[PDB]
């Protein structure tokens, strides 16, 4: 499950650390996670950074992994 040279020397600054570090990744996907962001919610985000079709794809897997493990939250109030 990894990603090709080219796709991650062209990704985000921001991800291209997500896709090197686990706890880098671990942090953000966190903070998607109670943001309260879908699955839906990060593709869109992550569209909207301009990003690969590879790269979307690399990262969906992992907050989908991250989302079934450790749950998704139902807002407060």
Same mark, same amino acid.
Request: aromatic share 12%; glycine share 4%; hydrophobic share 40%.
């Given at each position: 499950?990894? #990603?090709? $040279?080219?796709? @991650?020397?062209? #990704?985000?600054?921001?991800?291209?650390?997500? &896709?090197? !570090?686990?706890? *880098?990744?671990?942090? /953000? #996907?966190?903070?998607? $996670?109670? =943001?309260?962001?879908? @699955?839906?919610? +990060? /593709?869109? &985000?992550? *569209?909207?950074? =301009?990003?690969?079709?590879? +790269?979307?794809?690399?990262? @969906?897997?992992? !907050? $989908? *992994?991250?989302?079934?493990? *450790? =749950?998704?939250? !139902?807002? +407060? +109030?």
């Amino acid at each position: 499950r990894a #990603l090709d $040279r080219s796709i @991650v020397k062209n #990704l985000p600054e921001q991800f291209k650390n997500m &896709y090197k !570090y686990p706890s *880098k990744m671990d942090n /953000v #996907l966190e903070s998607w $996670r109670t =943001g309260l962001q879908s @699955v839906d919610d +990060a /593709v869109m &985000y992550m *569209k909207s950074l =301009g990003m690969d079709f590879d +790269a979307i794809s690399h990262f @969906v897997d992992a !907050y $989908r *992994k991250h989302i079934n493990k *450790k =749950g998704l939250p !139902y807002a +407060a +109030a």
